[model samples]
Target chain A: TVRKNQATLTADEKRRFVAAVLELKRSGRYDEFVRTHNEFIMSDTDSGERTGHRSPSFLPWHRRFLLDFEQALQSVDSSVTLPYWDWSADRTVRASLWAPDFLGGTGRSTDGRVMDGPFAASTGNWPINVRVDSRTYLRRSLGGSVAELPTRAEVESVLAISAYDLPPYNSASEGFRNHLEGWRGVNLHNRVHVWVGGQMATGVSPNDPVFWLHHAYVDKLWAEWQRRHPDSAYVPTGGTPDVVDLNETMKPWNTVRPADLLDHTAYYTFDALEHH
Target chain B: AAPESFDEVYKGRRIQGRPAHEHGGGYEVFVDGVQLHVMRNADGSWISVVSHYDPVPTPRAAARAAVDELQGAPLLPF
Candidate 1:
C-alpha cells in the first residue's frame, strides 16, 4: 500500500521510506526533484498563457509531479514510498521525520547547517546542489524562522477558499491568484512558505523535509475544495497559450491530463475531510 | 502603445522602470529599478516582491533576481 499521510506510516515504513530518499540523494537524482518543482512552481501561475495553477489542471499538474517524485523514491528502494511529514503536528524539530534515521533535525541558528540526517555533510549524499545564494551546502533552521506552525483552524480557512474559487471560476484572475498565492491579503501559500523557512522559503528549497508535508496539506486543501463544489469544474477550457488547458495532458506523465487527475479517489483516501 | 518608462534616483541609486499594471497594484520589476517588492515579514528578512518564494537580505538583490527571471518583460504597475 502507498503511504498516504504521515499519521498512518509505521516506524518500519518510515525507515524504508527515508532510506530510499537518501539513496536517491546519494545517487545525485534527489536534487533534480527540487529543481523540477521550482521550475514548475514558478512558471505554473495564473498569468498569460501559463494557466495551470488557476485551471482544473492545477490539481493534476501537482498530482503527477508528486507521483514522479514518489516513483523515484521507489527506484531507490521499491519498498520505499514518500511519507507526509505533517508540519502542523510536528511543529518542532522533535518530529520523527527529522530524526537521524529520517531527514535529520534543524540547522544551527547563525548559518543554518543541518548537523545530522542523510543530507548531513558527513553522509555526503544529500547535497544542496541547487543553490541561489552564497551558501553552498544544505541548511535548515526549524523554528528559528517561524515561531509556530498553522493550527488546524488556520488550514480550514484556506480550505474554505474553494467556495470563493467556484461559480466565479476565478483562479485565473490576477487578484485571486496573488491573494491565493499569499503575497498579500489573507495570504495562504506565501505565508506557509515563509513559515517553513530555511530552504523551504526559497525557490531551490527542497533541503528542508517539511516541503512534502506542507504540499500534501496544500493538496489536501484542494481536495477539500473539490468536495465543496461538485458542479464546479476545471476552467479556462481550451485555446489557452502556455497554460495547461483542462483536457491537456500534464508533464512528468504526459499521458494523464487534468481531467484524469480531477479524481483523487483512485490514488488514496482522505483521513477525514471537513464535511462528510 | 508601450507604457512610458520611469528613470530617476530613489534613495541614492539610479532607478529605472517600464511600468504596466493596467490592473492596478502589480509589480514594477526592473534591473536597477530599486526592486519594488522585497517585503519583510514580522521578523524582517525579505521575501520576493511577486511571490513569497525566497528571502534575501536586501531589496536590490531580490530586484536583481526578479529582473533576470523576467527576461526583460515590462514591469508591472508600481
Candidate 2:
C-alpha cells in the first residue's frame, strides 16, 4: 500500500475515500476510534508515565494505530488507502485538501461548524458525537488557533537530529521524537492539530478524518528519519520506569511492541518519502 | 500577596493550583483535590495530558478544558 498526498488525490479517489469514511461512521465503527484516542490521551502523561504521545513509542504506536484504521477502510473499499496531508506544502486553507469536494474548508466565524464537505454536519452525515460541548457539528478553525504550519526547513531541522530520543524521553527531551512530537523546538505534530483546530485539537482528535492523514505523514517522516540517520535508533532500550521500552509490549493491543513497529516496510510505504 | 495558591469551584467540581517547581514558576493543578499533571508550554500556554495537544492560557484553563472534555468520567491513572 502506498499512501499519497491528500492534495494529489484524484476525483474518483476523493469520492471513494469519502464513501469509505462515511460507511465506517454509519456502522458505528468510527466513534470508537475517537473514544480510544481520548482514553490514551487521558492516561498518557509527559512528566510521569507516558506511552503513545510523548515517548519513543509515539512513532510506532501511531504506525500500528493507522494500520488498524487503514485495514478497516480497505475492508470497506479495497482501493481506498490512507493519504497524508503534507502541511508544509499544502499549508494554506485554499489548498485543494480543504476544497468542498474534499475534506471541506474552514468552519464559519460565528460558530466553528464546517458547512461543506461530506463530513459537514449540515449534511447530517458527520456529527460531533464525541465533543466538549453541546453544539453538534464537524468544526475546524483552520489557521485560526495557530498562525502557521511547520515549514520544510523546520521539518528538516528536526529530521537532522541524531538521537531517536534522549534521557527522560518525554516532552522535555531534546531529540527527534519529542521535537517531531511538537512538545519542544519548532513544534511539528501538535501544531498541525492546533492549526486544524476544533476536534483535531482535542483529546478525541480522531473525530476529524484529517487525524489519520496527518499521522500518516508523521509516520512517513519517521521512515525518512530512519533513512537519514541509519546509525540512530529508539533509546531507553530497556529498564526504564513507566516508559515503553523498545521491546516491551504497548497497551490496548498489548500484543504488539515498539520493536515490531520500528520498521515501516512491514506495514506500508509512502508514495514519496524525501530523505536527507 | 497574590495568593501562591488558587481554590475555585466549577461545574460542581473543585480545582486548585499551587506554586510548582518543575519548569520554572508555573502552577500544578488538582481536580476535586486529586493531583493532575498539567504542563506549561514553551509559549507559556498550559496543557494537561487529557487534552495534551490543546493549549489554554492558564493552568486553571487547562484543567477546566480537561474536565470539560472528560464530561465527568474519572480520569484513569497514568
Best-matching candidate per TM-score: 2
Report the C-alpha displacement of residue A130, candidate 2, in angstroms.
1.8
**Clashing residue pairs in candidate 2, if any?**
none
Q: Please give the lDDT score at residue A64 for candidate 2.
A: 90
The runs of at least 3 residues in candidate 1 whose Cα sits more than 4 Å from the true structure, single-residue gaps closed, are: A42-46, A51-56, A162-185, A240-242, A270-275, B1-78
lDDT of model 1 at position A266: 77
User: What lDDT tens digits, residue by residue, belong to model 1 across residues B1-78?
Assistant: 322455554433455544441112133434443344333332233445333454455444455545433333443333
Docking quality level of the chain pair in candidate 2: incorrect
Error in Å for residue A10 of model 1: 2.6
Local lDDT at B19 for model 2: 73
Tens-digit per-residue lDDT, A161-260, candidate 2: 9999987887778999999999888999999998987778877689889999899999989999999998998787899997999889998799999999
